[PDB]
Design a protein around this ligand. Structure first.
Ligand SMILES: OC[C@H]1O[C@@H](O[C@H]2[C@H](O)[C@@H](O)[C@H](O[C@H]3[C@H](O)[C@@H](O)[C@H](O[C@H]4[C@H](O)[C@@H](O)[C@H](O[C@H]5[C@H](O)[C@@H](O)[C@H](O[C@H]6[C@H](O)[C@@H](O)[C@H](O)O[C@@H]6CO)O[C@@H]5CO)O[C@@H]4CO)O[C@@H]3CO)O[C@@H]2CO)[C@H](O)[C@@H](O)[C@@H]1O
Ligand code: NAG
Ligand code: CL
Ligand code: CL
Ligand code: CL
Ligand code: CL
Ligand code: CL
Ligand code: CL
Ligand code: CL
Ligand code: CU
Length: 235
């Protein structure tokens, strides 16, 4: 149970984005139904009045929280991967439009899931803005919590992988458009009951055998990390 509070750009807090530049749902409940339109940008997908301006090569940091800003972020039980996708805003997230910019699942050195790392990062994880066409975009940050993913929602609707999905409205201003955005996958559609990483038992299967759901990260993606970039108590 987690939500995005706002974003930072190059380590500068853009301010509370809830219902402003984030297409915020009304609460932190998960999405579980893989075929639902809620998979696109959660349960209240609509245009919100602001977009955050960035330039290619900028660091865009999502900041998540549980109840209040910079709290415990998400329950530590919610082990799982984190991804970020991008689509053009003109799509409204419909169609084969979602391109993966970032994936982190299980880190064998530190023996930590992405979610664990996110808590340590005070809710912050980033992507570097790619060299796509200037214009308006949706960045879709997705946390998958696997604590009840040994069942499939489609078979048992009280269990299933949980998706915490947040779409940010981002305007890319300066960019030379040298890596124009390739085709995308659909949400809903990309994840199905047979997709690797959707049904998994994190209690009896070693985490090293976990494979996150495709698609793979776009070759044109410029990187990203789960790491604190700014201190919410000060700015
Ligand atoms: O040798 C070890 C053996 O381990 C076995 O594996 C076991 C393992 O031992 C055990 O840890 C595991 O137990 C998990 C359960 O299966 C799973 O269902 C459970 O789900 C919890 C979850 O931990 C918890 O975080 C979650 O809390 C929700 C809550 O439901 C929700 O209502 C609340 O909502 C509020 C919002 O948070 C709040 O912001 C808002 O204001 O109000 C909302 C409404 O009040 O949100 C919280 C999260 O914040 O609830 C679920 C239960 O619903 O997680 C357990 C793990 O902690 O089971 C494993 C299998 O039994 C191996 O199988 C064996 O081989 C090994 O030998
Ligand atoms: C899952 O979503 C699909 C598409 O909206 C819908 O038909 C189906 O009824 C949903 N499943 C449940 C259990 O609500
Ligand atoms: Cl839960
Ligand atoms: Cl603010
Ligand atoms: Cl759902
Ligand atoms: Cl708050
Ligand atoms: Cl950190
Ligand atoms: Cl550029
Ligand atoms: Cl579907
Ligand atoms: Cu939860």
């Amino acid at each position: 149970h987690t939500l995005v509070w706002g974003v930072w750009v190059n380590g500068v807090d853009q301010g509370d984005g809830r219902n402003i530049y984030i297409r915020s749902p009304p609460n932190n409940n998960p999405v579980k139904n893989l075929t639902s339109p809620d998979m696109t940008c959660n349960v209240d997908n609509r245009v919100v009045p602001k977009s955050v301006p960035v330039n290619a090569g900028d660091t865009l940091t999502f900041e998540w929280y549980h109840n209040t800003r910079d709290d415990d972020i998400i329950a530590s039980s919610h082990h799982g991967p984190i991804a970020v996708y991008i689509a053009p805003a003109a799509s409204n997230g419909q169609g084969n439009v979602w391109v993966k910019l970032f994936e982190d699942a299980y880190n064998v050195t530190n023996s930590t899931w992405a979610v664990d790392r996110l808590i340590t990062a005070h809710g912050q994880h980033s992507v570097v803005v790619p060299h796509v066409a200037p214009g308006d975009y949706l960045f879709r940050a997705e946390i998958i919590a696997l604590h009840e993913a040994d069942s499939l929602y489609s078979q048992n609707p009280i269990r299933g992988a949980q998706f915490y999905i947040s779409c940010a409205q981002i305007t890319i201003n300066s960019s030379d458009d040298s890596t124009p955005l390739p085709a995308g996958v659909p949400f809903p559609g990309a994840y199905t009951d047979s997709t690797p990483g959707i049904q998994f038992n994190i209690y009896t299967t070693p985490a090293t055998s976990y494979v996150a759901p495709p698609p793979s990260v776009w070759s044109g993606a410029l990187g990203g990390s789960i790491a604190q970039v700014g201190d919410a108590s000060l700015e």
